[PDB]
Amino acid sequence: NQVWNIARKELSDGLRNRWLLAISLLFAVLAVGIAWLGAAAIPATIASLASLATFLMPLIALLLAYDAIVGEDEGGTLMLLLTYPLGRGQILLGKFVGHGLILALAVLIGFGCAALAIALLVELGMLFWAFGRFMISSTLLGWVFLAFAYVLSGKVNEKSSAAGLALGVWFLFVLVFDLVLLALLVLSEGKFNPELLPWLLLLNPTDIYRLINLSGLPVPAAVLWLCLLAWIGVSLLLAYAIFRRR
Template identity: 45%
Template sequence: MELTQITTVAGKEFWDRVRNRWVLAVALVFAVFALAIAYFGSAQQGSVGFSSIEVTIASLVSLVIYLIPLIALLLGFDAIVGERERGSLDLLLSLPITRTELLLGKYLGLAGALTFSTLAGFGLVAIVLASRLDLTSLFHFFGFMFSSVLLGCAFLSLAVMLSVFASDRTRASGLAIATWFFFVLVFDLALLGILVGTGGQWGGEALPYALMFNPADVFRILNIFSLDDVRNLYGLATVFPTQLASPWLLGLIMAAWVVLPLGVAAWRFRRTC
């Protein structure tokens, strides 16, 4: 693989998102929602204003799990199939660039745009709240930002894989929405239904390990166990093994969710296009 070809494609994808103001729009969405949660997240308890980093992160985790996967899937679902439908894929592949280089370049460009938007949006919040946070709180907030980037990259990797497998943009978009529903809504409900339906006699011990098969759950656990107050707030301190909640282990699992779907996409792309 040639690094020049990859960076050229990645740069084009990134600057295309900058020129059409996609990056700015997403960054503003993240900033507005995060600031609103930071200052009004405790309104239901009768107080307004920033209360603590624990409450803020707990609320932001719920927001990010719904928002970032959807944005990432919509960003990448037509990365390959869109080029195929427009008739530009054959032209691109006629250039001195391999299929793997093209795929990696597109992914890295889109991931760069998503990463920049995420860091810019939440970074603005960190600047606004900096005077109210100590170094430990800032460290945890930056950890939350980094894990949000990993979550977005994981779902973007899934989106690119779907784009390679889909035969047209309509199917790709449908698969992207179905993927969002499955991982964000259906997966946890299915596990809960199994536990309730069996009276907790089946699947209880395997539940923590089953959650590793969902990048959204890995992200949630990574942030829940980063702060004691957040962990107690979610009530998982007694049912989730602490050895499985190691930040390094969860980070490696999130990285696997980035690499594996992208590897499957590259394998499929080399053989079908």
């Protein structure tokens, strides 16, 4: 299967990416240094780790895959690859597997060394369930912004404006959408029902990421897992629909 044959490239190309390994080291240092100041200075420190992985796991995913499609179009290999026995779906889905297992490994070095810094500086029956819920949901947050990066790469025609949109999606989905949620609270009260606001949190995958790190809320947990996976499944379907229109 060539969905794996193009996935083995992106592992080998991602592990020699100098930009990724700098940030993934910085992700693992900040995950111990928050955990050092949460034990020496727990659900109170796993919430501060959730604010860290809401900053960086969208940033790691957008650093990997903002030049996934349009970086191959600028390199000319994309027009070459379509002449191979390859659909346009298998290029995208295989890059999603290849870029997906990088940040599925970058949280295993990120939080795999953070769980080592808690297990040697403190309960471990609660640790492997609160971090199993943390590492899985941090990968699924990263796979949304991976699929967001494939959407913006397929729309743009140049690599320089791809980073201009990947920064734009990162600003909008991390810290502009919640600032306009507060501005809809503190500046609008006659036309803003605040009971509706626990339901508008499902329109933001960074927000659904924190909600499955804050339980340990009108909706249950199982819809919240299926609302994070729906952000993958719609945006990958959006990325496949956009990639077929090049």
